[PDB]
Amino acid sequence: RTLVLYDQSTEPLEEYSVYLKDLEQRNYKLEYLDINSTSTTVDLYDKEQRLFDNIIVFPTKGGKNLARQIPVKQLIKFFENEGNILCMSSPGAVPNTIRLFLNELGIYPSPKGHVIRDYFSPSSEELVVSSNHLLNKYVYNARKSEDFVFGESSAALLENREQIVPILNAPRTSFTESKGKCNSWTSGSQGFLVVGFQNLNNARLVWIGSSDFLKNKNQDSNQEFAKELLKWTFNEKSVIKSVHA
Amino acid sequence: FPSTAGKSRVMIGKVEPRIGIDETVPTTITVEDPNEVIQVNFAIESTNKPFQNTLLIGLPNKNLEMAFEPEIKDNGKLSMYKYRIDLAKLDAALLQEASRSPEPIKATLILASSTAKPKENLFREILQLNLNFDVDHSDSSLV
Amino acid sequence: MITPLDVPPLDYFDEVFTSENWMVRIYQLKKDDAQGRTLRDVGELTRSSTKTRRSIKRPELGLRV
Ligand SMILES: *[C@@H]1O[C@H](CO)[C@@H](O)[C@H](O)[C@H]1NC(C)=O
């Protein structure tokens, strides 16, 4: 019922098991397709119906591979029909296909070279983000202060849509530092680090603005945020039903 | 010694220059001077050699800031920056949120050079201005 | 005389029926887009697809509430 569209070229799949396995602890039939090697095309529908109800797209430098497996129009068709999506795009792997899809959805990620730099931070090593920036209590409500880790992050701008669902936020002193001279993409708390989107058919997409988040090394800091993120992204955390009106 | 000037919308409104915080690289304070259409406020703050320099104007408690970048001149052995805020070119959601909620629009300044020792960079609220106008919501905000 | 260029496309309505002598024409309002974008942008995307702005530029939006 679930796909896993990874790319062994940039970030192998081995280092994404601690959460993937957890999915199989619950009821989740997982299928895998390494765009980097495979040449055939995936099959999303059975008889004008949905073969797969979830999708996952780990980091990928971009190219004809995922463009052929899942083009923008096919993604939008699979979304309009109730189907959940999870995307990630660090400043090293920004798949143009996913970027254009999101832009179609109001979420404007940052381009290749731009990286979120942020002084006044707990550790110089990486972008540690405090638990104070969480915005939605129906996605993950922090109990005690925790610090999430983003190695190479990438913010995103947002339109004012009723459908968009901010989840995290960048530190107020953080800016996107392009190597080439350009305007700073995001600046401060107007640049988002984790975003969600709920379709008008109650379908759900979630964009994580980094590749070092869902990894295995950072499990201890991120264990309790990532699980609830996946739950919400897969319509298993906050679903509402109306009866006998 | 940067002088940030909010030209005007109308009249002149006022400034509550409160800091009420710990000693985070404090230096001289802002001095206001109405001398032209632009009513300029001159401040002399420390760590005057930063790589990133911005002015955030808004309400941090609601995440509605706006970033302004200054223009640097090379007078020599000096540090002057002019932030030109136009009160009629400010984001709609900001004026309306300032009106709806009686919370002052705070203007914070950030200088940091990416390599200075921790606590050598400045993140201090150098101004806190207030307005009393007629902000209409018949075309309401996205907020 | 009418030429094909004189008539711009319809982005918000679908044609569901036209009589045999084109005397009565019945259109239907299409439901708002699921992704919550303007139907005009959907239209321009499907129609003028062969030539799109492949350059990346800050969209110059306003402050997110
Ligand atoms: C996939 O990546 C591997 C490197 O891990 C490489 O052997 C191969 O060239 C790539 N696939 C294609 C079709 O180039």
Swiss-Prot record, chain A:
Keywords: Endoplasmic reticulum, Glycoprotein, Membrane, Signal, Transmembrane, Transmembrane helix. GO terms for molecular function: glycosyltransferase activity. One of its GO terms (cellular component) is endoplasmic reticulum membrane. Residues 1-245 are lumenal. Glycans are attached at N36. Pathway: Protein modification; protein glycosylation. Subunit of the oligosaccharyl transferase (OST) complex that catalyzes the initial transfer of a defined glycan (Glc(3)Man(9)GlcNAc(2) in eukaryotes) from the lipid carrier dolichol-pyrophosphate to an asparagine residue within an Asn-X-Ser/Thr consensus motif in nascent polypeptide chains, the first step in protein N-glycosylation. N-glycosylation occurs cotranslationally and the complex associates with the Sec61 complex at the channel-forming translocon complex that mediates protein translocation across the endoplasmic reticulum (ER). All subunits are required for a maximal enzyme activity. Component of the oligosaccharyltransferase (OST) complex, which appears to exist in two assemblies comprising OST1, OST2, OST4, OST5, STT3, SWP1, WPB1, and either OST3 or OST6. OST assembly occurs through the formation of 3 subcomplexes. Subcomplex 1 contains OST1 and OST5, subcomplex 2 contains STT3, OST3, and OST4, and subcomplex 3 contains OST2, WBP1, and SWP1. Interacts with SEC61, SBH1 and SSS1. Present with 14900 molecules/cell in log phase SD medium. Belongs to the DDOST 48 kDa subunit family. This is Dolichyl-diphosphooligosaccharide--protein glycosyltransferase subunit WBP1. The lineage of its organism: Eukaryota, Fungi, Dikarya, Ascomycota, Saccharomycotina. The gene is WBP1. The chain holds residues 25 to 269 of 430 of the full protein.
UniProtKB/Swiss-Prot annotation, chain B:
Belongs to the SWP1 family. It is found in: Endoplasmic reticulum membrane. It comes from the Eukaryota. Residues 1-143 are lumenal. Component of the oligosaccharyltransferase (OST) complex, which appears to exist in two assemblies comprising OST1, OST2, OST4, OST5, STT3, SWP1, WPB1, and either OST3 or OST6. OST assembly occurs through the formation of 3 subcomplexes. Subcomplex 1 contains OST1 and OST5, subcomplex 2 contains STT3, OST3, and OST4, and subcomplex 3 contains OST2, WBP1, and SWP1. Interacts with SEC61 and SSS1. This is Dolichyl-diphosphooligosaccharide--protein glycosyltransferase subunit SWP1. Subunit of the oligosaccharyl transferase (OST) complex that catalyzes the initial transfer of a defined glycan (Glc(3)Man(9)GlcNAc(2) in eukaryotes) from the lipid carrier dolichol-pyrophosphate to an asparagine residue within an Asn-X-Ser/Thr consensus motif in nascent polypeptide chains, the first step in protein N-glycosylation. N-glycosylation occurs cotranslationally and the complex associates with the Sec61 complex at the channel-forming translocon complex that mediates protein translocation across the endoplasmic reticulum (ER). All subunits are required for a maximal enzyme activity. It comes from Saccharomyces cerevisiae (strain ATCC 204508 / S288c) (Baker's yeast). It is a multi-pass membrane protein. Its main location: endoplasmic reticulum. GO terms for molecular function: structural molecule activity. The keyword Endoplasmic reticulum applies. Keywords: Endoplasmic reticulum, Membrane, Signal, Transmembrane, Transmembrane helix. Present with 8450 molecules/cell in log phase SD medium. One of its GO terms (cellular component) is endoplasmic reticulum membrane. Pathway: Protein modification; protein glycosylation. GO terms for biological process: protein N-linked glycosylation.
Curated annotation (Swiss-Prot), chain C:
Residues 41-65 are annotated as: Disordered. It is found in: Endoplasmic reticulum membrane. It comes from the Eukaryota. Belongs to the STT3 family. Present with 3000 molecules/cell in log phase SD medium. Catalytic subunit of the oligosaccharyl transferase (OST) complex that catalyzes the initial transfer of a defined glycan (Glc(3)Man(9)GlcNAc(2) in eukaryotes) from the lipid carrier dolichol-pyrophosphate to an asparagine residue within an Asn-X-Ser/Thr consensus motif in nascent polypeptide chains, the first step in protein N-glycosylation. N-glycosylation occurs cotranslationally and the complex associates with the Sec61 complex at the channel-forming translocon complex that mediates protein translocation across the endoplasmic reticulum (ER). Despite low primary sequence conservation between eukaryotic catalytic subunits and bacterial and archaeal single subunit OSTs (ssOST), structural comparison revealed several common motifs at spatially equivalent positions, like the DXD motif 1 on the external loop 1 and the DXD motif 2 on the external loop 2 involved in binding of the metal ion cofactor and the carboxamide group of the acceptor asparagine, the conserved Glu residue of the TIXE/SVSE motif on the external loop 5 involved in catalysis, as well as the WWDYG and the DK/MI motifs in the globular domain that define the binding pocket for the +2 Ser/Thr of the acceptor sequon. This is Dolichyl-diphosphooligosaccharide--protein glycosyltransferase subunit STT3. The lineage of its organism: Eukaryota, Fungi, Dikarya, Ascomycota, Saccharomycotina.
